[PDB]
Target: Trypsin, cationic
Amino acid sequence: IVGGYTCGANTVPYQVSLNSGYHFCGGSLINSQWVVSAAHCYKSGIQVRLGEDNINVVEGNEQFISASKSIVHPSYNSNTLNNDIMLIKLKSAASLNSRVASISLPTSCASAGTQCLISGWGNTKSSGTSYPDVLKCLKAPILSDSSCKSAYPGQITSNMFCAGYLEGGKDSCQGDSGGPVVCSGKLQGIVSWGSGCAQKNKPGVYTKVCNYVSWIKQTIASN
Ligand SMILES: CCOC(=O)CO/N=C(/c1ccccn1)C1(c2ccc3c(c2)nc(CNc2ccc(C(=N)N)cc2)n3C)CC1
Ligand SMILES: [Ca+2]
Model:
């Protein structure tokens, strides 16, 4: 997260860290046994780390659970990043409590202007690399489709939306991928891609979760 602030330990209880000997992507806990992340975060040997704040120190409240299976959307396209969404089933159910809780799926799509909270342990620098120990947060609005399409001509599909600041300076970045974009208590987006980080006229692009609620429910119900 570039230009954000320290969230504060366990203030984003649905935030998950995907780990394979190091943090590589974020995720959102949607129920005691399922996590939603980005398809481009797919990798074998995934350990889901819940209740984390400082990812480099065991401080208490952490739950490390192996993924029993990862389900990348069948229509995910690695070239266009269309349908960049993946479901991860935990080997065991997480212990839900004050510091580890699930986020609700939306019942309707969010409108332009809606303010949302984006979080993660990704790069905190626009020019260079600096990864934080603790979870960073950023409040950013959902941009209009016209502004989004004008920023990335021909690269925005109906399963994507832009959120952030055109003036640059505040944005999600590498390492934040797969993480949550929560608006009014509903998970509306998944950190997906962008051109650089926090660059002027190059806002972040996110997977439009509201287009996948039926798919998510049907898939979870059959696995
Ligand atoms: C770094 C090398 O990348 C390449 O060579 C190809 O990039 N190809 C594309 C592309 C996207 C959509 C449609 C067509 N082509 C891209 C692209 C595509 C996928 C990407 C990407 C950049 N960067 C990432 C890494 N994560 C990331 C980056 C920036 C973010 C942001 N600004 N909010 C949020 C997350 N991922 C994941 C240049 C914009
Ligand atoms: Ca920790």
